């Protein structure tokens, strides 16, 4: 959508991630593993519920109103009764149609946004020690075992701890 | 730091999002079918088929319309002094008493329907010089003839029908609804037989208003053995005002007043069964749940109901775009 | 890998977007004129000036209004049994027969206009004791006097006008529209000359309704030589019901019924020329194209039309912001 | 607009690009060149058409309605006939005015978004071999002939092929 | 290139945004209370309590309703030929002349209210054979009896009331409003005493229309000593048409016409004080400022006013989200 | 909001910045300071005013309308007069409620956007001489006195002037 992460630079979703909406898969020293990110999952869910609750906020009640079905032909006044209701229904139908269209458009950009925010947040944290492979994966240029992967995920990763190892691996090489 | 930290390996971390095998199509500002992970329906499109008798007070009219229950057709005597939040009128209702017509039927049905009560107080009208309690074989009450319970048909006494001139003050602190009528005879002979004068006249007034109706002789179609008709009229008398009924023939006199109130009552035409369940929203198709914001069951509703809409489905996306990883 | 790249230079790649020299200003949530590459108008603001005669069935009323075509003014005899999707009434239309007035003209014009047919079936009413086919020199049919083709003016026979009491059953399975009337004489002499009784009376009824009208004698302004008037009334008779016409003078009798239908017909007042072209949306100003969503030509429309709006222009941006590189 | 590419970090448009809405201009060993990008051009156009079609979706039809012009003065009922229509027209006019305002605001941010997405996409691909000059242009730090520029554009550029040449040129220098 | 000389250090630059200690909660598509730096109210919810007498022409009706000012109740003679943009009617207004009722009071009040003028032109009607200027002790003008200034009560001369047949052409180029009436006597004796004929009749017509009203004898409630009533009727006469008044008893004749115009005038029921101030928007609760888009003071308004809304507060965020250093 | 700068990667606002909506705080070898950025402050303010003015654009005026309060009970026609007005008020109330909700949602994302644009703009300018500490602050890897900080702020900073000092400080170190 607007941010171009979902159905964008991230090629496709993971039907296998059943524990959250956004998350991490890694492949490291000890093998490959997956893990949902619960903070962005909660942020997306709360916003959609908030939006949802606003839409279901109070059905107003109405009691005696006007007749809306007639069995005899009367002319002027019954023509008006019919016209007041028909123009009421078309105006409310227009409203419902436009509301779910704006709403849905926004729900797709919002969830696009949270994906992109989680990406940017991880980018920022890895600092000079990783490079973006451009498809939503980072190449981490230093040995990063499962506890290192868990610190990136739970947001306690210290880039300094690996900076010289990483900068060496990343740049030096032979050019 | 360490010493020569030599282990030159790397790791890969990929971010992604879920996807589901199934997924729902929703409309958007730019697309009218785009597939999302999950959606929720916003249009209620089905009724239970039964009018729940709770929380509103449903009064089933059975084979009485509200106006016959008001007038007091013998067969609707069940409804005297009855009350309702919603009076349901059934398609099978029938009238079975003196053939009558009501000039603005539609307003009288409304006006009673939202007052919500058929509470009747009898008042001591004194009709001097006329024969009271006239009845007809087209309005059988029991084995005998009869007439509307709430109306009083006056005819001559002996050889005369005087000019009636009665008054009834509204001394209470509420509005009083009086239902009265006029008898239209089929023949001039019928007119003189019943009311002596060859031309009747009814004038009902208050300080604020007056209605004078004169009867119209002539044959109408045979309905329950009769070609005559009576037409029904109404007068509201405000606190402190006074009713004066003045007639010289053909008056179908009131026996007292219905009292009026102000409330949330209304009437509904429906053949849906009443059933025991609680439901706030009533539709002529039966109750419906007001959990969704819009409904497509019927434009006629009573109670806390979803807004009627022409659409029968509107899905609100409650999830991200579904971009499956194969689809299984 | 590769060998000595002696030269080691750089490149520059720049991303950009187009711009146009011209560009259109559009409104926004935050700006009311911001310039974009391209936009499309959403308000239709001009008519062709001609009512296309296709796809709807346009009936041009020429110098007849629909009510005179219904009643059968001699000069509108062209329209008998005619039908329409849209009857166009012209400002030039004139009446040219016995001066008449229609108590709720507006409903009778509506009710006929959307029925969409002037199909008339003549029925065998038998008027015994009166002279039929009365006519007048203010309603010339050909060289002679005449009257409305669909109405039948009854006057006395010899020295008597009896009490007419006729009935006509609705045995078909459709509703029947009866147009009838009452003659208001200018003088009591005119009243007795024509109808003998010094006070006429017309009562037309069904099982469901009744109308009794009594005439009113007095001079009105001279219209086509006359000070008298006739007033037009209507009665719909449902399948299975029965019409009873009972009168004692002044009845302008029906000659049969118009049949009623239910459709998409309506009437429109317009002096726009009808022309051959297909157009779904008709406006009193001529047809307009319903390609845009909103229109500003007229609030009166018939057919598939854009929603009328007060604005005469609303541009939808169909391109990016225009940021050109030259000066102005 | 929201992304600040168009009429933002990209100073102005190119009146000369007639073959697409977004695109590239380069300078390399073999000379200068311009070329439209058709994928982002199609993405912007499809979204705007989609939006457009939804707006032109079905004029509803109406037949017999109420009278809206009157020649005599009647009072209570004609006052109502006039009020029903006047409040119908103002409600529909409000709707049309708000609809094109939301729509246009979105069309400007959407096209801003596609510009920015094309930029990010190119950024990602050049990896460590280019730097952003901050004006929507990348400085590519290695020899990149016309075929190299074509591979960045058609998205087949392999950064590895030039990484050591680029890293040398880019960093080493004398500091 | 640039030569450092000696120093080796770094700097830190941080970007941020403001925050305020206070902050306002606003509703959002996704949240219904989210706190922002600043907001502005969009619903006007209070009136000054006073109707500003500027810019519109307010006419305070004091203890006259507009219909009594029209008819010319003695105590409302202050309003003759008066004009207004908004006539304010007060709850204290009272009538104090011959008891009258107006069949479609509501339309006559409307029709006069938006014409905006009570300009009356007297016309030379010649009533031959009747006694003019009848008056009543229930409509005291000064010490004496009196009647409505704009109406003329005709009774018999000697022993006869002739058939009046008068005409008045509309030769001007504007519409003329004629207010006339009929007297309903309490007793047949009253009828013959005043009008000789035992049954009156009034027919007022133009080339386009006609009204015939017949009086109705009978006792109504005592109002200012009387049981009789007069009912008020109106006829507009278009340029080039002609009024014909024809009566045989009971006519309350017009004395001329009110002229009609087309403007922005209307009437308002309000007990708010008029005061000197300029304000475009008037509410029965007093004027309100139309600086905000919506208002919650009253659904009844006159002038350039905010749109009435059920909500009493709607805040538009005019700043960013408030994320303070400490708390809120 | 959508960009995740405000109430996002930028932890909280500064109650102390009284001279503008967005701005800078620095610490260099000559001291520490604060300064509002007036261009982004003006950009946010102009957009919100533009939005505001559109909302207060013309109260339409209405003169004779229909009666809306009644003292007697009349039935069919008065029921219609009441229904026309009640459905008019609910339609206008729906409109007002939806309008401020869309509006406010957009004002929070717009101001989020400007914060993020000012960040990106500064990022772009510092080029290879600074790193993002991930919390809205850059670590400038070269000696940058108060005039240097002023040039970043007023947008005249030349990265080349400090590039070798910075690249040395930033990378070389010991890995
Ligand atoms: C005026 O004309 C009407 C219509 O012709 C007359 O109405 C008809 O009157 C007869 C005799 O009263 C009715 O007959 C009865 O019908 C029922 C059902 O068929 C039957 O049980 C009785 O044995 C008898 O046949 C007939 O139904 C009635 N029809 C209608 C449509 O009303 C009326 O009598 C005439 N009146 C005068 C005073 O001339
Ligand atoms: C009641 O009063 C009205 C109004 O004064 C009388 O109406 C007028 O009657 C005369 C004589 O019939 C009409 O004269 C006609 O004028 C036309 C030309 O306009 C001419 O072509 C005819 O040959 C005839 O001379 C006059 O037009 C008419 N005016 C109006 C406004 O109706 C009416 O006659 C009186 N009726 C009685 C019974 O007193
Ligand atoms: C028809 O019946 C009505 C109601 O009974 C009669 O009305 C009443 O008539 C009396 C005598 O005129 C009125 O009395 C007068 O009342 C005033 C105020 O109290 C007082 O000043 C007089 O001295 C006298 O008492 C009484 O108010 C009036 N009531 C009503 C409700 O109208 C009417 O007179 C009867 N008419 C006939 C012809 O029988
Ligand atoms: C046809 O016979 C009856 C009837 O209806 O059964 C007998 C009934 O006792 C009589 N009641 C009175 C009060 O007169 C009634 C009227 O004469 C008739 O309805 C006038 O329309 O007629
Ligand atoms: C004025 O002369 C005429 C006319 O109109 O030409 C002659 C006409 O034969 C006559 N027709 C009948 C059925 O009586 C008619 C009425 O008497 C008059 O319209 C009553 O209003 O009057
Ligand atoms: C009761 O006495 C009065 C009155 O009203 O004061 C006397 C008054 O001179 C008289 N005026 C005329 C024109 O007759 C009036 C009518 O007779 C009465 O109103 C008919 O209803 O009666
Ligand atoms: C993050 O992960 C590391 C490795 O599991 C662990 O030691 C650390 O405590 C974690 N921190 C939090 C807040 O979970
Ligand atoms: C789909 O959305 C609705 C509303 O948010 C929710 O009740 C439902 O559980 C969701 N479905 C799934 C599979 O999460
Ligand atoms: C109806 O209620 C009134 C008021 O209590 C009472 O006097 C009257 O007798 C009741 N009648 C019936 C039939 O219930
Ligand atoms: C509800 O009732 C109406 C009229 O009885 C019918 O046309 C409609 O289809 C019904 N809808 C549902 C959901 O029952
Ligand atoms: C402008 O937009 C309309 C609708 O998208 C389109 O038909 C037209 O061709 C566009 N103009 C140009 C120059 O592309
Ligand atoms: C009108 O149509 C009916 C029904 O077919 C027919 O009997 C009648 O004679 C027609 N009359 C004319 C004038 O067309
Ligand atoms: C359409 O007709 C109306 C009334 O005839 C006129 O006022 C209006 O300006 C016309 N508009 C157009 C586009 O013809
Ligand atoms: C991309 O460009 C290079 C150079 O022209 C060419 O060899 C390659 O095949 C192109 N790939 C595609 C998919 O166009
Ligand atoms: C809050 O917003 C309103 C409208 O923009 C403005 O007049 C007011 O000054 C603002 N408050 C502050 C403290 O800026
Ligand atoms: C009312 O105005 C008219 C027209 O100028 C004038 O002839 C008439 O005498 C005025 N009457 C009063 C009482 O002002
Ligand atoms: C305005 O007046 C109405 C009726 O007089 C009252 O109910 C309402 O509360 C008043 N509102 C204000 C703001 O004065
Ligand atoms: C930017 O700041 C530097 C240091 O104060 C100054 O020399 C330069 O002129 C400033 N430029 C502008 C445009 O303010």
UniProtKB/Swiss-Prot annotation, chains A, D, F:
**What gene, per UniProt, encodes this protein?**
HA
Q: What is the protein name for this chain? A: Hemagglutinin HA2 chain
Name the species this protein comes from: Influenza A virus (strain A/Aichi/2/1968 H3N2)
Identify the glycosylated residues. 154
Q: Which cysteines are joined by disulfide bonds?
A: 144-148
